[PDB]
Design an enzyme around this catalytic site. Structure first.
Site, PDB file in Angstrom:
ATOM      1  N   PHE A  62      -8.870  -2.051   6.100  1.00 51.20           N
ATOM      2  CA  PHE A  62      -8.793  -0.648   6.467  1.00 51.20           C
ATOM      3  C   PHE A  62      -7.394  -0.112   6.509  1.00 51.20           C
ATOM      4  O   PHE A  62      -7.199   1.067   6.778  1.00 51.20           O
ATOM      5  CB  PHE A  62      -9.469  -0.409   7.824  1.00 51.20           C
ATOM      6  CG  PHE A  62     -10.930  -0.712   7.823  1.00 51.20           C
ATOM      7  CD1 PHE A  62     -11.429  -1.806   8.538  1.00 51.20           C
ATOM      8  CD2 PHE A  62     -11.817   0.072   7.081  1.00 51.20           C
ATOM      9  CE1 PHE A  62     -12.788  -2.104   8.521  1.00 51.20           C
ATOM     10  CE2 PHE A  62     -13.172  -0.225   7.060  1.00 51.20           C
ATOM     11  CZ  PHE A  62     -13.657  -1.315   7.776  1.00 51.20           C
TER      12      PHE A  62
ATOM     13  N   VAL B 118       0.353  -2.712   6.244  1.00 52.83           N
ATOM     14  CA  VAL B 118       1.442  -2.600   7.215  1.00 52.83           C
ATOM     15  C   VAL B 118       2.749  -2.892   6.535  1.00 52.83           C
ATOM     16  O   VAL B 118       2.919  -3.949   5.927  1.00 52.83           O
ATOM     17  CB  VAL B 118       1.240  -3.563   8.416  1.00 52.83           C
ATOM     18  CG1 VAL B 118       2.334  -3.395   9.464  1.00 52.83           C
ATOM     19  CG2 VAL B 118      -0.112  -3.314   9.055  1.00 52.83           C
TER      20      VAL B 118
ATOM     21  N   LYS C  14       2.002   1.508   9.558  1.00 53.98           N
ATOM     22  CA  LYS C  14       0.666   1.144   9.238  1.00 53.98           C
ATOM     23  C   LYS C  14       0.088   2.298   8.471  1.00 53.98           C
ATOM     24  O   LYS C  14      -0.078   3.390   9.008  1.00 53.98           O
ATOM     25  CB  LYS C  14      -0.127   0.894  10.520  1.00 53.98           C
ATOM     26  CG  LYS C  14      -1.639   0.898  10.355  1.00 53.98           C
ATOM     27  CD  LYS C  14      -2.289   0.384  11.625  1.00 53.98           C
ATOM     28  CE  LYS C  14      -3.758   0.039  11.410  1.00 53.98           C
ATOM     29  NZ  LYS C  14      -4.233  -0.733  12.594  1.00 53.98           N
TER      30      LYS C  14
ATOM     31  N   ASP D 135     -12.197  -6.368  17.772  1.00 53.61           N
ATOM     32  CA  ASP D 135     -11.613  -7.217  16.750  1.00 53.61           C
ATOM     33  C   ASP D 135     -10.487  -8.036  17.358  1.00 53.61           C
ATOM     34  O   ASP D 135      -9.365  -8.121  16.804  1.00 53.61           O
ATOM     35  CB  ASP D 135     -11.092  -6.378  15.586  1.00 53.61           C
ATOM     36  CG  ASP D 135     -11.126  -7.126  14.220  1.00 53.61           C
ATOM     37  OD1 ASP D 135     -11.849  -8.156  14.078  1.00 53.61           O
ATOM     38  OD2 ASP D 135     -10.443  -6.642  13.272  1.00 53.61           O
TER      39      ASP D 135
HETATM   40  O1  0SY Z   1      -2.395  -2.402  13.510  1.00 56.12           O
HETATM   41  C1  0SY Z   1      -2.286  -3.475  12.937  1.00 56.12           C
HETATM   42  N1  0SY Z   1      -3.427  -3.997  12.289  1.00 56.12           N
HETATM   43  C2  0SY Z   1      -3.351  -5.322  11.600  1.00 56.12           C
HETATM   44  C3  0SY Z   1      -1.991  -6.034  11.747  1.00 56.12           C
HETATM   45  C4  0SY Z   1      -0.947  -5.320  12.391  1.00 56.12           C
HETATM   46  N2  0SY Z   1       0.301  -5.757  12.589  1.00 56.12           N
HETATM   47  C5  0SY Z   1       0.934  -4.787  13.255  1.00 56.12           C
HETATM   48  C6  0SY Z   1       2.213  -4.820  13.704  1.00 56.12           C
HETATM   49  C7  0SY Z   1       3.068  -5.856  13.318  1.00 56.12           C
HETATM   50  C8  0SY Z   1       4.377  -5.938  13.804  1.00 56.12           C
HETATM   51  N3  0SY Z   1       4.874  -4.960  14.702  1.00 56.12           N
HETATM   52  C9  0SY Z   1       4.018  -3.904  15.066  1.00 56.12           C
HETATM   53  C10 0SY Z   1       2.706  -3.853  14.579  1.00 56.12           C
HETATM   54  C11 0SY Z   1       0.057  -3.802  13.518  1.00 56.12           C
HETATM   55  C12 0SY Z   1      -1.116  -4.116  12.955  1.00 56.12           C
END
Ligand code: 0SY
Ligand code: ZN
Lengths: 318, 90
Positions: free
Chosen positions: A31, A34, A52, A139
């Site tokens: 969905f 990143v 994201k 999740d």
């Molecule tokens: O919202 C997410 N979904 C799947 C994986 C993910 N990794 C991060 C993320 C990674 C490092 N720092 C902030 C957010 C955010 C997310």
């Protein structure tokens, strides 16, 4: 390769060019994707930022719903917050402070036992927090719980799949349909889903996230990940019955309106022997398995809750 | 009636058709496989329609209309309540 992805992200949301030097793609998912970026803060320092990018086929309420969880519950108690969000028609990008994190598979068989208490401790803080707002995450799994081992920092991420408890303090969650009815619900990973979710139970509470935390703990205790390797829901359930017992699962499912038939009876496993055989690690206390037992309670009504878990004897004295 | 091994789940109040799992073998806990292995080792929400190739659906006029509509106001509302704090360049 990713050069194209990055370039297309700037093409999609023009305004990003002004603000971010996008350095890399760090994740893709069903969905969203990143990216890692650098920005300058009005206050002086340069900051590393995760961007994201949501899939343009996402419903606006779903987008806003995710965003609202991040605004209200986020930013505190190991829950991810939001700096800013950018849209251009159907392309939305959420910006978050960036937490450099480990692979779960990596640290899996290398953590001291103490680091395991700390990890579990910190995951229940986060779930206590989201549960107060009536957010059912849906999740919870290691890849949605960022762990920095060196800094001892933690972060629950991704509300793209969340639902509300019937009395959610998060208004937009009320417009998200449940899988029971068939905006649309989003499918999660079978191996972290509780039996009431696997059996398509219309009543789904925050207990489902606690079970997910149990599965994580099972992986930490047993040294195996993914513990449940299943691609559909019933396979997952069949594996659960092998661990927790088919009789016990049949009985528990009667309490929530589901009649489960199984042709091969399988007994419940002692959790200590199971974990010990699958493997401070010389003296794992009884309290650890006792807690695992309460997390993997087949009955969602009796399953331990996030704030109860924080008071478990497993967690004296922290 | 059903070939074994099987699993059947029924809704006790008839709110669902039963659903089923049939496998060659039931899961078995393998303590012999090595750490860290398991011991057991689309649709547009906007246009409410399935597609096969995303790239094309995104350019289709059903989607392009939605994409350009006022629907994202609820997003916009939540957004204009956050505080921007990065430097923006011209
Ligand atoms: O919202 C997410 N979904 C799947 C994986 C993910 N990794 C991060 C993320 C990674 C490092 N720092 C902030 C957010 C955010 C997310
Ligand atoms: Zn569409």
């Amino acid at each position: 390769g990713v050069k194209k992805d990055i370039e297309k992200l700037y093409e999609a949301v023009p305004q990003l060019s002004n603000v971010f030097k996008i350095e890399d793609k760090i994740g893709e998912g069903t969905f969203s994707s990143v990216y890692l970026a650098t920005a300058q803060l009005q206050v002086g320092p340069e900051e590393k930022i995760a961007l994201k990018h949501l899939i343009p086929t996402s419903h606006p309420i779903r987008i806003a719903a995710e965003l609202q969880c991040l605004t209200v519950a986020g930013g505190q108690d190991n829950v991810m917050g939001v700096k800013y969000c950018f849209r251009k028609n159907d392309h939305v990008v959420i910006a978050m402070p960036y937490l450099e994190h480990e692979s779960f598979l990596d640290i899996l068989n290398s953590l001291s036992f103490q680091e395991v208490r700390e990890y579990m401790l910190n995951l229940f803080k986060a779930l206590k927090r989201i549960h107060q707002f009536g957010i059912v995450h849906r999740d919870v799994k290691p890849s949605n719980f960022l762990y920095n081992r060196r800094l001892k920092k933690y972060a629950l991420v991704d509300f793209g799949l969340a639902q509300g408890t019937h009395d959610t303090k998060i208004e937009l969650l009320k417009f998200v349909q449940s899988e029971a009815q068939q905006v649309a619900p989003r499918a999660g990973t079978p191996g972290f889903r509780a039996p009431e979710v696997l059996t398509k139970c219309p009543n789904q509470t925050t207990a489902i996230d606690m079970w997910s935390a149990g599965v994580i703990f099972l992986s930490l205790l047993s040294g195996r990940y993914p513990f449940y390797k299943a691609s559909d829901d019933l396979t997952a359930l069949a594996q659960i019955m092998t661990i927790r017992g088919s009789r016990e699962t049949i009985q528990a499912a009667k309490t929530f309106g589901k009649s489960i038939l199984c042709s091969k009876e399988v007994p419940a496993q002692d959790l200590r022997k199971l974990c010990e055989r699958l493997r401070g690690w010389n003296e794992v206390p009884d309290e650890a398995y006792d807690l695992l037992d309460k997390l993997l309670d087949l009955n969602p009504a009796s399953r331990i809750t996030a704030e109860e878990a924080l008071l478990h004897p497993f967690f004296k004295d922290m | 009636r059903l070939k074994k091994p099987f699993v059947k789940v029924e809704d006790m109040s008839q709110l669902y058709r039963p659903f089923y799992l049939q496998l060659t073998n039931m899961p078995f806990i393998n303590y012999s496989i090595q750490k860290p292995c398991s011991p057991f080792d689309g649709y547009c929400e906007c246009c409410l329609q399935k597609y096969e190739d995303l790239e094309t659906h995104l350019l289709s006029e059903q989607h392009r209309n939605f994409a350009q509509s006022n629907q994202y106001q609820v997003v916009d509302d939540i957004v204009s309540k956050l505080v921007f704090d990065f430097v923006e360049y011209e």
